[PDB]
Amino acid sequence: IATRVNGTPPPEVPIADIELGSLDFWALDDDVRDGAFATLRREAPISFWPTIELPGFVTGNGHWALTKYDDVFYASRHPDIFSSYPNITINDQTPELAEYFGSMIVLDDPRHQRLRSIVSRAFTPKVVARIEAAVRDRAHRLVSSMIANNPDRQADLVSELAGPLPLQIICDMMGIPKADHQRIFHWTNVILGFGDPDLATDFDEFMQVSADIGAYATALAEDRRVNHHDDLTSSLVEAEVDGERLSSREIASFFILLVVAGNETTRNAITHGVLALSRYPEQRDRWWSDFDGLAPTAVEEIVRWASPVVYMRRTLTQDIELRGTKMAAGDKVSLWYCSANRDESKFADPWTFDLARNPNPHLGFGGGGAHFCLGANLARREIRVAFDELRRQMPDVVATEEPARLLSQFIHGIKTLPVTWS
Ligand code: HEM
Ligand SMILES: Cc1cc(CCC(C)C)ccc1NCNO
Ligand SMILES: [Cl-]
């Protein structure tokens, strides 16, 4: 595809053209989206928007959009005010889906910390360092297979590498048999792709997929309750929180959170990273000339640039005012990481994709504090190893078409990215 000029700011977007409540807005290209958030940061840093109407979802009240880095950081660090209960997407959750989506991410402390403590050891730096060889093995073989399977030197990066790598890693951590990885992939994509006609627009399919992955979780849990294995599902069924085992719905919700969180966002970080190296070849050249020296900053700049999670939602527990804006107890609040990560008052040259950027206190893993991404160290490893394997096996891998972008307010997804190599 065409490259662009690195450092170019987005087009001006008049504030009257911005409709965060319309699915059509989220189909526009990233230049327009980035320009819209730049206009909000400048002219309306806290503003109120209707909730997008999705067939079968509960619309409910609209939300206050926090677009400034400092406000997203403030909300994240004050959970006694900005609660993660009852949901962390904007749209209200049906009582039927609460059975499958009531994990620790929609809970406050103390119960959130008790739940997180069941699995946190498995994601600490020493424990993930052990997973590193498996990441290396899977990434090496996926890229080798891309080359063996495609003598025409053309393939889809998403289906051949970015998707399978994080999926295989988290499924093995969970104890899921390899035969079932494609069902997990499909379920993940329906749950986080709803509203995109290429994935699912029918709510019956969304509820069927939810029910099926919940039933799958429950059967695997029952098996592990009979026969322990060295995996996260056995951890879940063996835990006790003050002498009480987790309920079937708590187990199903934990399993679904871990599986979905563990593959989709990393997949999109890799695809956006390859697209950026394609658009800014100077950065590829710099990184390839010193891979290990630049990898720390390069991986962080890929996450800042991609912002794979566009926003997370909070709910006020009390009246507050910020920047002169009075917000009421019970109001929804949306935290726009995609905007915080272009905030001109926090980042020098925010429109420059600079793989040497340092410091880089981006909010791609959230604003910090109680819910800080459990998998951040694992994600950074998977990204660094995927790019090292591309450098080694197909260093000129480059996108040949513009991405097919996922239609989503929540996930900065790429459905397909055709690439070519020498
Ligand atoms: C580049 C990849 C990733 C990105 C951009 C990302 C982003 C995020 C964000 C924005 C949050 C919410 C943070 C907050 O509310 O303050 C989060 C939470 C979480 N992430 Fe990730 N994540 C990534 C990879 C992973 C991986 C590989 C896993 C492995 C399972 C994972 C597991 C989780 C979990 C379990 C939570 C909920 C934590 C809690 O509620 O305490 N994430 N992530
Ligand atoms: C994309 C996403 C969605 C959610 C809520 C949706 C359900 C499936 C838990 C939670 C975490 C993440 N990702 C975090 N880390 O990848
Ligand atoms: Cl103030």
Nearest CA to ligand 2 atom 6: 257
373 labeled binding residue: yes
Nearest CA to ligand 1 atom 42: 375
Q: Which two tokens stand for residue 33?
A: 């989206």
Tell me the C-alpha distance between 108 and 153, whole Å.
49
Query: Residue 419, class by beta-carbon neighbours within 10 Å (0-12 exposed, 13-18 middle, 19+ buried)?
Result: buried
Q: Which two tokens stand for residue 186?
A: 């499909």
Q: Please say whether the dihedral angle defined by the alpha carbons of residues 168, 172, 173 and 175, taken in this order, is positive or negative.
A: positive
Resolution of the experimentally solved model in angstroms: 1.8
Q: How many structural domains are present in the chain?
A: 1
Tell me the C-alpha distance between 331 and 63, whole Å.
7
d(CA 373, ligand 2 centre) in Å: 10
Query: Three-state DSSP class for 81?
Result: coil
Length of the chain measured in residues:
422
Does ligand 1 come within 6 angstroms of the Cβ of 261?
Answer: yes
Query: Residue 257 CA: which ligand 1 atom is closest?
Result: 35
Phi–psi pair at 83, nearest 5 degrees: -80, 145
Q: Which two tokens stand for residue 268?
A: 């999109």
Experimental method: X-ray
- State yes or no: cis peptide before 110, omega within 30 of 0: yes
Q: Please say whether the dihedral angle defined by the alpha carbons of residues 193, 199, 205 and 210, taken in this order, is positive or negative.
A: negative
Phi–psi pair at 218, nearest 5 degrees: -65, -40
> What are the residue ranges of helices labelled H in 95-196?
111-119, 125-149, 157, 164-174, 181-193
Exposure b/e, 290-304, CB count within 10 A at least 16 = b: eeeebbebbbbbbbb
What is the number of the ligand closest to the CA of 120? 1
Tell me the C-alpha distance between 214 and 253, whole Å.
8
d(CA 417, ligand 1 centre) in Å: 24
Give residue ranges with CB within 6 A of ligand 2: 101, 103, 105, 191-192, 256-257, 260-261, 264-265, 309, 373, 375
Tell me the C-alpha distance between 261 and 383, whole Å.
15
- State yes or no: cis peptide before 395, omega within 30 of 0: no
Q: Which two tokens stand for residue 146?
A: 């891309």
What is the number of the ligand closest to the CA of 323? 3
DSSP, residue by residue, 201-238 = --HHHHHHHHHHHHHHHHHHHHHHHHS--SSHHHHHHH
Query: Residue 48, class by beta-carbon neighbours within 10 Å (0-12 exposed, 13-18 middle, 19+ buried)?
Result: middle
Query: Three-state DSSP class for 395?
Result: coil
Does ligand 1 come within 6 angstroms of the Cβ of 372?
Answer: yes
Tell me the C-alpha distance between 8 and 3, whole Å.
12
d(CA 261, ligand 1 centre) in Å: 6
308 contacts 411 by C-beta, under 8 angstroms: yes
Strand intervals (E) in 227-269? 240-241, 244-245
d(CA 150, ligand 2 centre) in Å: 33
Nearest Cα residue to 71 out of 58, 81, 62, 61: 81
Q: Which residues contact 180 (CB under 8 A, 6 or more apart)?
A: 171, 216
Q: Which two tokens stand for residue 75?
A: 């909300």
What is each CA distance from 215 to 168, 202, 205, in whole angstroms? 20, 20, 15
- State yes or no: cis peptide before 359, omega within 30 of 0: yes
Query: Residue 379, class by beta-carbon neighbours within 10 Å (0-12 exposed, 13-18 middle, 19+ buried)?
Result: buried
Amino acid letter at 74? Y
d(CA 26, ligand 3 centre) in Å: 30
Q: Which two tokens stand for residue 230?
A: 């060295």
Phi–psi pair at 66, nearest 5 degrees: -95, 115
What is each CA distance from 396 to 275, 306, 316, 388, in whole angstroms? 12, 21, 49, 12
Does ligand 1 come within 6 angstroms of the Cβ of 256?
Answer: no
The residue range of the domain holding 95 is 1-422
How many angstroms separate the most distant Cα atoms in the chain?
A: 62
Q: Reduced to 3 DSSP states, what percent helix, strand and coil does the chain have, rounded to the nearest 5? A: 50, 10, 35
